[PDB]
Protein backbone atom coordinates (compact mmCIF):
# COMPACT_ATOMS: atom_id res chain seq x y z
CA UNK A 1 0.00 0.00 0.00
CA UNK A 2 0.99 3.57 -0.80
CA UNK A 3 -0.85 6.33 1.15
CA UNK A 4 2.05 6.39 3.66
CA UNK A 5 4.20 8.04 0.97
CA UNK A 6 1.85 11.00 0.46
CA UNK A 7 1.62 14.46 1.93
CA UNK A 8 -2.02 14.31 2.91
CA UNK A 9 -3.90 17.54 3.68
CA UNK A 10 -7.17 16.63 5.42
CA UNK A 11 -10.66 18.09 4.79
CA UNK A 12 -9.65 19.38 1.35
CA UNK A 13 -8.27 5.13 -0.74
CA UNK A 14 -5.26 2.82 -0.90
CA UNK A 15 -6.52 1.94 -4.39
CA UNK A 16 -6.17 5.57 -5.42
CA UNK A 17 -2.69 5.96 -4.04
CA UNK A 18 -1.57 2.61 -5.53
CA UNK A 19 -2.91 3.42 -9.01
CA UNK A 20 -1.32 6.87 -8.70
CA UNK A 21 2.01 5.37 -7.54
CA UNK A 22 2.35 2.92 -10.43
CA UNK A 23 0.98 5.45 -12.92
CA UNK A 24 -1.08 2.54 -14.23
CA UNK A 25 -3.35 3.63 -17.09
CA UNK A 26 -2.27 7.28 -16.81
CA UNK A 27 -1.66 9.69 -19.78
CA UNK A 28 0.78 11.69 -17.60
CA UNK A 29 2.73 11.63 -14.35
CA UNK A 30 0.37 11.64 -11.30
CA UNK A 31 1.71 14.40 -9.02
CA UNK A 32 -1.38 14.62 -6.81
CA UNK A 33 -4.82 13.10 -6.18
CA UNK A 34 -8.06 13.48 -4.21
CA UNK A 35 -10.00 10.74 -2.44
CA UNK A 36 -10.56 8.97 -6.13
CA UNK A 37 -9.15 11.03 -8.97
CA UNK A 38 -5.68 12.07 -10.14
CA UNK A 39 -3.71 15.13 -11.32
CA UNK A 40 -0.46 15.89 -13.23
CA UNK A 41 -0.28 19.06 -11.11
CA UNK A 42 -0.10 19.75 -7.33
CA UNK A 43 -1.12 22.64 -5.04
CA UNK A 44 2.10 24.45 -6.05
CA UNK A 45 0.67 24.84 -9.59
CA UNK A 46 -8.62 15.00 1.43
CA UNK A 47 -5.71 16.01 -0.87
CA UNK A 48 -2.65 13.80 -1.28
CA UNK A 49 0.54 14.98 -2.97
CA UNK A 50 3.49 12.91 -4.14
CA UNK A 51 6.59 13.68 -2.04
CA UNK A 52 8.62 13.26 -5.25
CA UNK A 53 6.81 16.40 -6.52
CA UNK A 54 7.28 18.26 -3.25
CA UNK A 55 10.61 20.00 -3.44
CA UNK A 56 12.76 18.59 -0.62
CA UNK A 57 15.10 21.48 -1.32
CA UNK A 58 15.48 25.18 -0.47
CA UNK A 59 17.27 28.38 -1.43
CA UNK A 60 18.89 30.60 1.25
CA UNK A 61 16.17 31.37 3.76
CA UNK A 62 13.55 28.91 2.49
CA UNK A 63 10.36 30.90 3.01
CA UNK A 64 8.49 28.80 0.46
CA UNK A 65 9.38 25.33 1.81
CA UNK A 66 6.51 22.84 2.06
CA UNK A 67 8.13 19.45 2.61
CA UNK A 68 7.08 16.90 5.22
CA UNK A 69 10.25 16.81 7.28
CA UNK A 70 9.38 16.83 10.99
CA UNK A 71 12.71 16.29 12.78
CA UNK A 72 15.26 18.65 14.29
CA UNK A 73 19.02 18.76 13.81
CA UNK A 74 19.24 17.22 17.29
CA UNK A 75 16.83 14.58 16.04
CA UNK A 76 13.86 15.64 18.13
CA UNK A 77 10.32 15.12 16.85
CA UNK A 78 8.58 18.41 16.11
CA UNK A 79 5.49 19.50 18.03
CA UNK A 80 2.27 20.07 16.07
CA UNK A 81 1.46 23.75 15.43
CA UNK A 82 -2.12 23.07 16.51
CA UNK A 83 -0.87 21.95 19.94
CA UNK A 84 0.12 24.32 22.75
CA UNK A 85 1.67 21.40 24.58
CA UNK A 86 4.38 21.25 25.62
CA UNK A 87 4.94 24.73 24.20
CA UNK A 88 2.42 27.52 23.80
CA UNK A 89 2.83 30.05 20.99
CA UNK A 90 1.14 32.49 18.60
CA UNK A 91 1.49 30.62 15.29
CA UNK A 92 -2.08 29.77 14.37
CA UNK A 93 -2.79 29.11 10.64
CA UNK A 94 -5.36 31.92 10.75
CA UNK A 95 -2.46 34.28 11.56
CA UNK A 96 -0.39 32.57 8.81
CA UNK A 97 -2.02 31.59 5.50
CA UNK A 98 -0.19 29.80 2.69
CA UNK A 99 2.84 29.36 4.92
CA UNK A 100 1.39 25.89 5.55
CA UNK A 101 1.53 25.34 9.31
CA UNK A 102 0.03 21.87 9.71
CA UNK A 103 0.98 18.76 11.67
CA UNK A 104 4.63 19.03 12.81
CA UNK A 105 6.20 20.05 9.49
CA UNK A 106 9.44 22.04 9.65
CA UNK A 107 8.76 25.66 8.61
CA UNK A 108 10.23 29.17 8.31
CA UNK A 109 7.18 31.55 8.22
CA UNK A 110 9.19 34.75 8.73
CA UNK A 111 12.24 34.05 6.57
CA UNK A 112 14.54 33.64 9.55
CA UNK A 113 18.25 33.41 8.82
CA UNK A 114 18.26 30.06 10.62
CA UNK A 115 16.05 28.45 7.93
CA UNK A 116 13.13 26.26 8.88
CA UNK A 117 12.78 25.18 12.48
CA UNK A 118 10.16 23.44 14.61
CA UNK A 119 8.81 23.37 18.12
CA UNK A 120 10.29 20.25 19.71
CA UNK A 121 8.17 17.65 21.49
CA UNK A 122 10.78 17.89 24.25
CA UNK A 123 9.44 20.26 26.99
CA UNK A 124 12.96 21.54 27.83
CA UNK A 125 13.75 22.61 24.25
CA UNK A 126 11.20 25.07 22.97
CA UNK A 127 12.28 25.37 19.34
CA UNK A 128 15.16 24.04 17.18
CA UNK A 129 16.33 24.45 13.61
CA UNK A 130 15.54 21.47 11.40
CA UNK A 131 18.50 20.29 9.27
CA UNK A 132 17.48 20.79 5.63
CA UNK A 133 19.84 20.65 2.61
CA UNK A 134 19.70 23.43 0.04
CA UNK A 135 19.71 22.56 -3.68
CA UNK A 136 23.02 24.29 -4.20
CA UNK A 137 24.56 21.83 -1.74
Amino acid at each position, epitope marked *: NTIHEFKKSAKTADQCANRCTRNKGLPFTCKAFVFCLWFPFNSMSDLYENKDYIRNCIIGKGGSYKGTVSITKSGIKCQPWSSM*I*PH*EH*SFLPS*SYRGKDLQENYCRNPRGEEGGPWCFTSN*PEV*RYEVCDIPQCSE
Partner: antibody
Amino acid sequence: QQQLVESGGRLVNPGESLTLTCKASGFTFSTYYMSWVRQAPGKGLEWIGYIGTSSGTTYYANSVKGRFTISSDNAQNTVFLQMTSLTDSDTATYFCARGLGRINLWGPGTLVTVSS
Amino acid sequence: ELDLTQTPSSVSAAVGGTVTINCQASQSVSNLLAWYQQKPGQPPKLLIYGASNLESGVPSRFRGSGSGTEFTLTISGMKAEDAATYYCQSGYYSAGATFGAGTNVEIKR
Protein backbone atom coordinates in the same frame (compact mmCIF):
# COMPACT_ATOMS: atom_id res chain seq x y z
CA GLN B 1 20.86 31.72 34.19
CA GLN B 2 17.72 32.94 32.43
CA GLN B 3 16.23 35.87 34.40
CA LEU B 4 13.37 38.33 34.41
CA VAL B 5 13.81 41.63 36.24
CA GLU B 6 11.09 44.25 36.88
CA SER B 7 11.63 47.93 37.55
CA GLY B 8 9.50 51.08 37.85
CA GLY B 9 7.60 50.20 40.98
CA ARG B 10 7.10 53.22 43.17
CA LEU B 11 4.53 55.34 45.05
CA VAL B 12 1.99 57.05 42.75
CA ASN B 13 -0.94 59.44 43.28
CA PRO B 14 -4.39 58.17 42.27
CA GLY B 15 -5.34 59.13 38.74
CA GLU B 16 -1.72 59.36 37.67
CA SER B 17 0.17 57.07 35.26
CA LEU B 18 3.24 54.80 35.58
CA THR B 19 5.52 52.62 33.45
CA LEU B 20 7.02 49.36 34.63
CA THR B 21 9.76 47.59 32.69
CA CYS B 22 10.76 43.96 32.54
CA LYS B 23 14.11 43.00 31.16
CA ALA B 24 15.12 39.43 30.34
CA SER B 25 18.63 38.02 30.60
CA GLY B 26 20.18 34.75 29.41
CA PHE B 27 17.61 33.74 26.77
CA THR B 28 16.02 34.48 23.38
CA PHE B 29 12.80 36.47 23.50
CA SER B 30 11.60 35.15 21.09
CA THR B 31 9.14 33.10 20.33
CA TYR B 32 7.42 33.65 23.74
CA TYR B 33 4.36 35.05 25.45
CA MET B 34 5.05 37.82 27.94
CA SER B 35 2.35 38.22 30.57
CA TRP B 36 2.00 40.59 33.55
CA VAL B 37 0.51 39.18 36.72
CA ARG B 38 -0.18 41.30 39.79
CA GLN B 39 -0.94 40.47 43.40
CA ALA B 40 -2.53 42.85 45.85
CA PRO B 41 -1.30 42.67 49.46
CA GLY B 42 -2.58 39.47 51.09
CA LYS B 43 -4.70 38.54 48.07
CA GLY B 44 -4.42 36.07 45.23
CA LEU B 45 -2.86 36.31 41.82
CA GLU B 46 -4.53 38.26 39.00
CA TRP B 47 -3.42 37.92 35.41
CA ILE B 48 -3.93 41.24 33.61
CA GLY B 49 -2.38 41.12 30.15
CA TYR B 50 0.00 39.52 27.69
CA ILE B 51 1.91 40.28 24.52
CA GLY B 52 3.37 37.95 21.88
CA THR B 53 6.85 39.24 21.15
CA SER B 54 6.77 37.96 17.58
CA SER B 55 3.09 38.71 16.86
CA GLY B 56 2.96 42.07 18.63
CA THR B 57 -0.58 41.04 19.61
CA THR B 58 -1.87 42.15 23.02
CA TYR B 59 -4.70 40.97 25.29
CA TYR B 60 -5.82 42.70 28.50
CA ALA B 61 -8.07 41.70 31.40
CA ASN B 62 -11.35 43.54 31.98
CA SER B 63 -10.10 44.95 35.29
CA VAL B 64 -7.39 46.72 33.34
CA LYS B 65 -8.25 46.82 29.61
CA GLY B 66 -9.31 50.44 29.32
CA ARG B 67 -6.20 51.95 30.90
CA PHE B 68 -3.21 49.59 30.67
CA THR B 69 -1.19 48.74 27.55
CA ILE B 70 1.77 46.46 26.88
CA SER B 71 4.64 47.06 24.46
CA SER B 72 8.02 45.50 23.69
CA ASP B 73 11.53 46.08 22.43
CA ASN B 74 12.70 42.67 21.19
CA ALA B 75 16.15 43.94 20.34
CA GLN B 76 16.59 44.89 24.00
CA ASN B 77 14.60 41.96 25.39
CA THR B 78 12.27 44.35 27.18
CA VAL B 79 8.55 44.62 27.87
CA PHE B 80 6.75 47.75 29.03
CA LEU B 81 3.63 47.83 31.10
CA GLN B 82 2.16 51.27 30.63
CA MET B 83 -0.46 52.10 33.23
CA THR B 84 -2.92 55.03 33.36
CA SER B 85 -5.76 56.32 35.53
CA LEU B 86 -4.40 54.41 38.53
CA THR B 87 -6.85 53.76 41.38
CA ASP B 88 -6.33 52.32 44.86
CA SER B 89 -7.38 48.88 43.57
CA ASP B 90 -4.24 48.78 41.44
CA THR B 91 -1.92 48.67 44.43
CA ALA B 92 -0.07 45.38 44.10
CA THR B 93 3.24 43.63 43.32
CA TYR B 94 3.60 43.33 39.58
CA PHE B 95 5.26 40.26 38.04
CA CYS B 96 6.79 40.02 34.61
CA ALA B 97 6.23 36.46 33.53
CA ARG B 98 7.28 34.23 30.60
CA GLY B 99 4.28 32.43 29.12
CA LEU B 100 0.47 32.57 29.05
CA GLY B 101 -0.77 29.10 30.11
CA ARG B 102 2.70 27.72 31.05
CA ILE B 103 4.80 30.08 33.13
CA ASN B 104 8.24 28.56 33.58
CA LEU B 105 9.86 31.90 34.38
CA TRP B 106 8.94 34.62 36.90
CA GLY B 107 10.47 37.88 38.07
CA PRO B 108 10.70 38.55 41.77
CA GLY B 109 8.18 41.41 41.20
CA THR B 110 8.07 45.19 41.63
CA LEU B 111 5.72 46.81 44.19
CA VAL B 112 3.30 49.51 43.01
CA THR B 113 1.50 51.58 45.69
CA VAL B 114 -1.36 53.90 44.62
CA SER B 115 -1.75 56.40 47.45
CA SER B 116 -1.86 60.12 48.33
CA GLU C 1 -15.85 35.69 31.35
CA LEU C 2 -14.24 32.48 32.55
CA ASP C 3 -14.57 31.51 36.21
CA LEU C 4 -12.10 29.19 37.91
CA THR C 5 -13.60 28.09 41.23
CA GLN C 6 -10.92 26.60 43.43
CA THR C 7 -11.90 24.68 46.56
CA PRO C 8 -11.27 24.40 49.43
CA SER C 9 -9.84 27.59 50.94
CA SER C 10 -7.32 25.63 53.03
CA VAL C 11 -6.21 22.08 53.74
CA SER C 12 -3.93 20.61 56.37
CA ALA C 13 -1.82 17.46 56.72
CA ALA C 14 1.20 16.01 58.49
CA VAL C 15 4.42 14.91 56.81
CA GLY C 16 3.89 11.96 54.45
CA GLY C 17 0.16 12.81 54.41
CA THR C 18 -1.82 13.48 51.26
CA VAL C 19 -3.82 16.51 50.22
CA THR C 20 -6.23 17.02 47.29
CA ILE C 21 -7.24 20.36 45.74
CA ASN C 22 -10.09 21.00 43.33
CA CYS C 23 -10.48 23.37 40.44
CA GLN C 24 -13.75 23.65 38.51
CA ALA C 25 -14.35 25.82 35.45
CA SER C 26 -17.35 27.80 34.22
CA GLN C 27 -16.56 26.71 30.66
CA SER C 28 -14.68 23.78 29.22
CA VAL C 29 -10.97 24.32 28.83
CA SER C 30 -9.82 21.03 27.33
CA ASN C 31 -6.78 20.09 29.42
CA LEU C 32 -5.50 23.69 29.26
CA LEU C 33 -4.89 23.98 32.99
CA ALA C 34 -1.89 24.69 35.19
CA TRP C 35 -0.94 24.41 38.85
CA TYR C 36 1.35 26.79 40.68
CA GLN C 37 2.99 26.89 44.09
CA GLN C 38 3.79 30.15 45.95
CA LYS C 39 5.53 30.82 49.27
CA PRO C 40 5.43 34.29 50.81
CA GLY C 41 7.92 36.86 49.52
CA GLN C 42 8.47 34.81 46.37
CA PRO C 43 7.01 34.55 42.91
CA PRO C 44 5.01 31.48 42.07
CA LYS C 45 6.58 28.29 40.75
CA LEU C 46 5.13 26.28 37.88
CA LEU C 47 4.11 22.77 38.96
CA ILE C 48 1.64 21.38 36.45
CA TYR C 49 0.75 22.30 32.87
CA GLY C 50 -1.56 20.71 30.39
CA ALA C 51 -3.52 19.03 33.12
CA SER C 52 -1.09 16.29 33.91
CA ASN C 53 2.24 17.39 32.59
CA LEU C 54 4.84 17.70 35.27
CA GLU C 55 7.32 20.58 34.91
CA SER C 56 10.93 19.46 35.13
CA GLY C 57 12.65 19.37 38.49
CA VAL C 58 9.36 19.00 40.38
CA PRO C 59 8.83 15.94 42.69
CA SER C 60 6.59 13.15 41.49
CA ARG C 61 4.47 13.47 44.64
CA PHE C 62 2.66 16.26 42.83
CA ARG C 63 -0.14 14.80 40.72
CA GLY C 64 -2.32 16.66 38.28
CA SER C 65 -5.43 15.24 36.64
CA GLY C 66 -8.74 16.15 35.05
CA SER C 67 -10.42 17.34 31.87
CA GLY C 68 -13.29 19.47 30.61
CA THR C 69 -14.42 21.36 33.71
CA GLU C 70 -13.06 19.13 36.54
CA PHE C 71 -9.46 19.20 37.74
CA THR C 72 -7.61 17.91 40.72
CA LEU C 73 -4.17 18.28 42.30
CA THR C 74 -2.89 15.74 44.77
CA ILE C 75 0.26 15.95 46.82
CA SER C 76 0.84 12.41 47.97
CA GLY C 77 3.93 12.17 50.12
CA MET C 78 4.04 15.52 51.79
CA LYS C 79 7.14 17.27 53.02
CA ALA C 80 7.53 20.31 55.28
CA GLU C 81 8.48 22.45 52.29
CA ASP C 82 5.13 21.79 50.59
CA ALA C 83 3.57 24.28 52.96
CA ALA C 84 2.54 27.01 50.57
CA THR C 85 -0.39 28.42 48.64
CA TYR C 86 -1.33 26.60 45.43
CA TYR C 87 -3.20 28.09 42.46
CA CYS C 88 -5.04 26.67 39.49
CA GLN C 89 -4.68 28.67 36.27
CA SER C 90 -5.92 28.38 32.70
CA GLY C 91 -4.29 30.34 29.93
CA TYR C 92 -5.10 30.47 26.26
CA TYR C 93 -3.46 32.24 23.39
CA SER C 94 -6.71 34.06 23.03
CA ALA C 95 -8.88 34.93 24.52
CA GLY C 96 -7.59 35.44 28.06
CA ALA C 97 -5.86 33.80 31.04
CA THR C 98 -7.22 33.43 34.58
CA PHE C 99 -6.19 32.25 38.03
CA GLY C 100 -8.07 30.58 40.86
CA ALA C 101 -8.58 32.12 44.27
CA GLY C 102 -5.83 29.83 45.59
CA THR C 103 -5.64 27.27 48.38
CA ASN C 104 -3.54 27.50 51.55
CA VAL C 105 -1.77 24.34 52.70
CA GLU C 106 -0.78 23.86 56.37
CA ILE C 107 1.53 21.18 57.76
CA LYS C 108 0.07 19.44 60.82
CA ARG C 109 2.80 19.16 63.44
